[PDB]
Every structure is written in structure tokens, then in C-alpha cells.
Amino acid sequence: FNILLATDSYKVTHYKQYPPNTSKVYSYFECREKKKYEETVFYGLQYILNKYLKGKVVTKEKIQEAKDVYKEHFQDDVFNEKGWNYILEKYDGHLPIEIKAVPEGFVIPRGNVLFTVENTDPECYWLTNWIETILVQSWYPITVATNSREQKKILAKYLLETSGNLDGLEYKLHDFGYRGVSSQETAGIGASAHLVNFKGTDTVAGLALIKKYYGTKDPVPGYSVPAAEHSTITAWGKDHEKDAFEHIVTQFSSVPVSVVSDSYDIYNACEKIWGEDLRHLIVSRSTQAPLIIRPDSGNPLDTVLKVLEILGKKFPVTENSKGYKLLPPYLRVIQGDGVDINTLQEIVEGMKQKMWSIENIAFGSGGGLLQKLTRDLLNCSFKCSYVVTNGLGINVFKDPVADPNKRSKKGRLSLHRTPAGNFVTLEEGKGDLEEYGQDLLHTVFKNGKVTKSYSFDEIRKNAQLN
Amino acid sequence: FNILLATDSYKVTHYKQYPPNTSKVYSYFECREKKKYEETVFYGLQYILNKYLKGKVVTKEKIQEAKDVYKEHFQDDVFNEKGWNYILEKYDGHLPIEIKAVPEGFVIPRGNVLFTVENTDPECYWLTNWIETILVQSWYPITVATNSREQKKILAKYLLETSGNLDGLEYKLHDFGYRGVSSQETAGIGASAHLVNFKGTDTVAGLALIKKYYGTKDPVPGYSVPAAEHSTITAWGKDHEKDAFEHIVTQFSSVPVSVVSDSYDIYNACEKIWGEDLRHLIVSRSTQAPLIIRPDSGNPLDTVLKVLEILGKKFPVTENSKGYKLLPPYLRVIQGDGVDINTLQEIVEGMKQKMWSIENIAFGSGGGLLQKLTRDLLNCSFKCSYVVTNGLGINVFKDPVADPNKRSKKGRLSLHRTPAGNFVTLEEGKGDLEEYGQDLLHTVFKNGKVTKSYSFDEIRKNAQLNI
């Protein structure tokens, strides 16, 4: 990794574009309000600070590699070799940058300052926005954590309504997304962001990221159970689906086991194979080791409702203290196909209308959870708000005539508690009036060192639901 | 990197679920047809083979790390330590796997085998599908290359129609997506996939990936020009936008230079600042060093058409030999906001209806090009189609009653040219009847070695448009 090659090409040319005698560039990150995701989990900057920004990030060799690449890339010698040599010689390759940030896991309304960046040496005025590209990739862990939290809110509401408690809430949305993301690095970041809110993952890459960058008191931040795939059922042959199911639930007799049941006919598998031929191997299992039947095709709501209606007529169903139907504790369902925040809401509402407890169901989500998200969903954006030029500070901003939603904030920013205990971003250095007490941003990075950090356990606490 | 920790958790348990006495698992990858992205660029597998699958990928230390993690993760000791030790001791940690693939850059219709995977040692029947998760991530470079190519087709059609050639086609869609992707690793892979079809990138990460994994005869696979951002304009102050523009075009007098012009009022910047106050610094510039005006907000079609209407009244417009209007060569426009395959089509059709040449415009795309894509867009999917159990081969598949589109192929697969020059995937080992040409799948990986590689130059040639 070479930070000289980890910016948008055009930023290589910015040191020639700022007003002459500019000693300070001060820039901020927000999830811009779009005058429905009203609050965001701030998570993921600490990963970036440690993996990419801290310590000696400049060497002789990195400067020469970048020089040689940019000469060809631009067909011209526009690279700031002198500016990067300055950092190597004055600071042993440590970035003279100060970043202030809201604590990780914090849950903040749209349109607030989340972090700020500024150069600490006048010579490095160009450096603040060099690192915009790398820091703005924060959008991804923020957006995965936020969208996973919104899904937890829906699950919380319906589980509380149909059961009278939240037992098992943190295992209700399992991460199926490892194959469905764009890379290994993405797998680990996105899986880690989902584990801010839940404990169930198949995306193994998330576990090592958490242990190296954040830390947990527990040995691991997330858990799984044995489960089949189409290959482990269909490999027995089209006439032997029963043989496959029997061998798998017998191999995994004393732990929970998920068994994909839609290879040929989900409704026949539920009613005849599980519900009649193999019923004796299901009703014997312990409460700690249920069979989880997994449909994987068809309309997600219609399929879930028919699977439950089938199982309800083959297995002894109870009515819980809320009046909702409940499968025996040895038998559960997981819908792991077509789940995103919209279909999840549809399935739990539909279950509730048919008097099925959300105790009966778990969800798996892959692309919906980790991939089908963009920087646009929360308007994650980094902008310059303040510069010093000829020793005078100026409040700077954009305000495009055709889109007032892209207006940016002015001047030096701070984050405060309101008298009602909400959040407000103060602009134009007005935080210094101290009419709203102390800035909630903390210095997290300064002059190549991480100065403040959060365990994963602290992050989970900050991100809890009301 | 530990390949023992680079699979979906449940696959750690699959070695206990396959039929006993199974000596072979054979699986394939396709972009399943949904019975419109009718053809897919196969690109990206070579990166995965070299970065993650080749050489000694198993050590004593990796097996113990995986053992310790899976113990806690499953609350149980279900990990296949003996199976992974077998690979370490018999093959010095090299995977006994054979992968066959269509050549990279090939352009293949939906619903065809692109690559196959099978174990070369009976002991390692479980290994074929262990590596499903890592191989299925090839969806991403395939889908970025495919979607970038479909955009090149749209640009090709409209540029040929409004100008009578394709000059500059390979610079018409610039990658703006570095900040808009989910990771550094993703930036490099997605940027490299876009450069299969175009030469203009700001996503620097793509250049080193191409040089390390593919290689080009040219020094670099992709190029950029100097350009402003809101910070380099707004830093001058709200009352000095004109000073910022003047200093920037004067700093970059002799090369092309893109200047974001919507900080306060794009229409005032075009009509009064560029079109009157600074016009003398624009009309002097060379054909090799145009000013590119960059709007960055509003309705993308409406804003492009009004920018061109303004510039057409302040600058000398010509009518090209097709009847379409053309800005002077020192002046161009780039729309780099809200561009995806749908808005791109809308803008060029709108320009065509208003008699503007596509010569006037370049596009920048960020999230649309590199991030707003999923494995579902081309139904990229990996399935087991053949096993050997008790020495007998059987053709296996799924065929869910409620979704016939998820039906999978049966048996040993091969890819062939049809008598009309199309493609066909043969099932059930029917390739061995040799009623069609050679199988187009080549061994690219075997027993821990990459056996066949493609230069990036070969991939660009394979992925060219017809015309």
C-alpha cells in the first residue's frame, strides 16, 4: 500500500489550484440531510486510521513509485514530489494531520459533523483533501451499520408485539453476504459493520478485522451454526433428497442445523419429507438444537406463509401469551433469499397478519445487507468549510443554485448537545462562544498517531436501540 | 490472508454432509439467464487465482488459527483439520483443484458455462465448494466490465450517428468512483474492469492491479487530466470564483483542464464568467488542451442541455457534416454527477434530439460505474452439476418448483461455437461426442499452479465492440 497512489488522480494537481499563501485547509464529513434513514451509526474510521494513515506512510521508494506512475498517467510531471519529500524529511513520513470525530457507535441525526480533518503544518495545506478519497470510504461501514440497525428496529418492533420480549433479537438477521460483495476487504469491513447490531454471521472475514482493529472481551464477535447448501442435498441425487436430509440432521443431532429444503419442491419437502417421513428425527431434538427449515426461492412473503401453514398442520403448534402461533422449540424457519429492509418489513407484517409469532423465523441477507448500498443512500460527503490565506481565516462552502440539498456548512464546526439532549452542529466557529458547552468531537488522529480509540464492545453499547 | 478463513461459515460443515464414498465434486459458474444484459465480459478470475489460490496456501499455523476461531464461532469443534492436514502433507499446501475457464475478455451470452472447478484428489471432494465464496466474487469484475461495455455501446451508437466516426470513444466515460466504493481492494478491481473498455480513470488503484496481475505493453493502462474540485474553487471565497477559474486555467494553460463550475451558479459561470469575463483565456487554448466545463448538480439531462445552449450563444459553433452542432475544439463539457447506464442513455438521446454532437460531451461516473451493482444483476451463480460416489458419476442439479429461472445445469459441461458462430453449453458430458468444435474452456489452474495467463492487452482485444 502506497498513500501517494490512494487518491483520485485530479487531487494530485490540487496543490497548484488553492489560493497562494494558503496555510490551512479544514474539511468535514457529514451524512447530508435530503430536504427514510434519519440517524446514522458512525462506525469504521478507526479501521482506516490504523490500516492506512498512522505511522511512517511516506518513504523515498513510495515517492519515486508515485513520481514514475503519475508521469505516465498524466503524460506530464505535475506530481508534488517536493511536498511529499517535506513530510518524509520533517516528520519521518508521519502525516501532519489532525482528525476529530464523534465516538464510534454513536447514533447521530442526518446533517451533523461526524469528523473534521486539518493540516497541522502550513506547508501541508494540500494534504487535508489528498486523503478525502480514503476517508470518504467510511460511507460503507457507516451505511452497512445504519441499514443493519434499521432492520433490527423492525425486528424489535414485531418480535416485541408478537412475543412480549426481545429474546433472540441479536440472532434474527444473519449475514449471508460473503460471496455477494465486491472483494475480500469489503467482506471484512461490511461483516464487521453488521456485527455492531447482530451476533450471527457467515462472513468469517469480519471476525479477524474486529479482533485486530477494535477488540472484544469475548473470544469472537460473531457466531454461526451448521447449515446445508444445494450442493450437499443435490449431490445425493434427485430421488434421494430424504436420504440427504436424514444424514445431515443425524450428523448434527445435538447442535442447531439449517437445511435448505427447496432443491426440487419446498412444499413437498415441508409436508411429506420433514412432516411425515423424517418427523420422528425432528420431534426428538433439543430446544438448544432445533432443525431450521430454509426455503430459498419463490415470492419471499408467500413462501414463508405457506411453509408455516404446512408446518403448523404437521407439528404441535402452541399459542403464546400474546395470541400468536408458535412452532415447537425443536423447529424454526430461516428465509435467506430476497431479504432486504423492504422485504423483511413485508414478511414480518404478513406473518403478524396471519397470527404467526416472529419467534418462528430468522432472516439471512447477503447482497441486500452488504452490497446493495451506495454513498448516495445517506449522502455521505466531505467538503472544505474553512481556509487560512495570507493569515486570515475564511468560511467557505458550496451552494449550487439548482440543488440546495448540496449546500455545505461554513467555517469551523463543532458538535453539541442541545438543551433537550439532541445534537446540533455549530458553524462559523460559534462553538467557541460556549453557549452550548463542550464539543462532542474528540481528536482521534494527530501527526501520524491514533490518539483515541474504541473497543467493539463500546461501539455495540453506543449503537443499542432505545 | 488465510484461505481456511475465506469461506462462508456453513461450508466449514459441508464435509460431513456429502454422500459417503464421494470422490469428485464438479461445480460451474454461469451468469444465469432470466427467461437487458444479454452478454457478459468474462474478466477477473486471473486476479483471484494469483492473489488467493496459487502456491502454498496451507500451513501448520493457518490450520491451528482456523481451528481456534471455528471452535469459538460454532461453539463446537466441527472443523475438518484432517482434510486440511492432508493437503499440507501430500501437496506442500497446494490446492488439488482444476479450474477451466473461457479466455478473459471473451464476450459470452447469458446462461453459458464460464468456468468449472473440480478436485484432482478423491480425498479433497469437499474442497471444490469450499472455494465457491472466493471464486463467486468474480461476479464483481465481470459485472463492472459488462456494464462499462454496455455504456460504450450506447456512446458508440450516438457518436457514430451524430459525428460519423468513433474518435475519442475510449475517453468518453471516465471513472470517478474511487471514493464511492466499499474498499481499497474493490477500487482496484472495479477500476481495472472499467479499463477493459475505456482508458480514462481517476481510480489510481486500478493501474497497479493491472501491472501486477495482467500487464500492458504501454507504460500505464489508463490516463487522467488536471481537474478542480469544490475545495479548489470555494477556497478563494464566494466573491472570487472568477479569480479561481483564471488561476486554474492559467496554471494548466498547455494541457486539458476540467473546471467544476456549479459551486454557486453553473448557468452564471457558463454565460458570464467563462462566456464573457474569461472568454479571452479560453478562445486562445489549443485543440490538445481544451477547457472542459464540469456541471455537478441539477437534473443531469436538463443541466447538460442548458449548459450547451448557453455555450453555443457565447462561442463560435459549427455544424458538422451530419447536421449536428459542435463547440470549438478548445471547449468541451463533462457531466460527472448522477451518471449511470440509464441517465447516460437519456443524455445522449436528449442531445441528439436537440441537434448536439456527442463530440461535445464526456461523462464521469462514480457510484453508478463501480458501486451500484450486485451479483443479482447478471445472476452470477456457482452450482454443483456432477459428482462421483462409489465410482459412479451422476448428473446433479437444483430445480425449485416455484422458480424455474434457478434451475441449474446437469453433469459435465463444455462451451462450444455453434455452426452460426454463437455459443452453446453442452450438458451431461455430451461435449465428448465431439459433434461441435473444441471446448472453449482452458485449464487456467491446476494443483496450485496458474497454467494459462492473459495479458491485459489480449483482454481488451477480446472485449472490443463489433463495429
Ligand SMILES: O=C(Nc1ccc(C2=NNC(=O)[C@@](c3cccc4ncccc34)(C(F)(F)F)C2)cc1)N1Cc2ccncc2C1
Ligand atoms: O442457513 C444458514 N445459516 C444459518 C441458519 C440459521 C441461523 C439461525 N439464526 N438465528 C437463530 O436464532 C437460530 C439459532 C438457534 C440456536 C442457536 C443459535 N446459535 C447461533 C446462531 C443462531 C442460533 C434459530 F435456529 F433459533 F433460528 C439459527 C443461523 C445461520 N446458512 C448459512 C449460509 C450462508 C450463505 N448462504 C446461505 C446460507 C445458509
Ligand SMILES: O=C(Nc1ccc(C2=NNC(=O)[C@@](c3cccc4ncccc34)(C(F)(F)F)C2)cc1)N1Cc2ccncc2C1
Ligand atoms: O472532471 C474530472 N476529470 C476529467 C475531466 C475530463 C476528462 C476528459 N475525458 N474525456 C476526454 O476526451 C477529454 C480529453 C481531451 C483531450 C485529451 C485528453 N486526454 C486524456 C483524457 C481526456 C482527454 C475531453 F477534453 F476531450 F473531453 C477530457 C477526464 C477526466 N474530474 C476528475 C474527478 C474524480 C472524482 N470526482 C470528480 C472528478 C472531476
